[PDB]
């Protein structure tokens, strides 16, 4: 889909930026628990997320 930042991504309630893994590492790591978009039930962004 064309268009830049129509809804922006939410990084709140997800893994921090410093914890991202380099794309070269094909090694698997245990999946974290309780990660979802934690915006205060507002704005068009992630309206139909887990919190709703």
């Amino acid at each position: 889909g064309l268009g830049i930042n129509a809804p922006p991504p939410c990084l709140t309630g997800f893994l921090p930026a410093s914890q991202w893994r380099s794309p070269a590492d094909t090694r698997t790591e245990p999946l974290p628990s309780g990660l979802y978009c934690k915006i205060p039930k507002d704005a068009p962004n992630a309206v139909r997320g887990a919190r709703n």
């Binding site: 991202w20 893994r21 090694r27 698997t28």
Partner: protein, 97 residues
């Protein structure tokens, strides 16, 4: 009981759906899904993407079809292909009763 023979074959997909369990370990190398980007800029794809539902639907679809391109290898022309809803003979559904 009718769908029992296909149950094991269906299981490969009926849970994940767009993913198939057989080839996940090699396509997805952990964090990032591998994918091949075949950007389509053909006139048929440009017609279907943008000019569908307008008055310029056949502006370039017919321009490309008049060339050497054949309708078999083109994305279907939604203006005429009768989908299971409007197809002649009533709607085309299968009901297990």
């Amino acid at each position: 009981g009718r769908a029992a023979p296909y149950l094991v074959g269906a299981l490969k997909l009926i849970l994940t759906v767009p993913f198939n369990i057989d080839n996940i370990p090699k396509a997805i190398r952990g964090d990032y899904i591998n994918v091949s980007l075949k950007l389509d800029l053909t006139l048929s794809s440009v017609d279907n993407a943008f000019l569908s539902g307008t008055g310029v639907s056949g502006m370039l679809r017919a321009l490309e079809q008049a060339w050497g391109r054949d309708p078999a290898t083109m994305i279907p022309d939604v203006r005429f292909t009768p989908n299971p809803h409007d197809a002649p003979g009533g709607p085309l559904v299968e009901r297990g009763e």
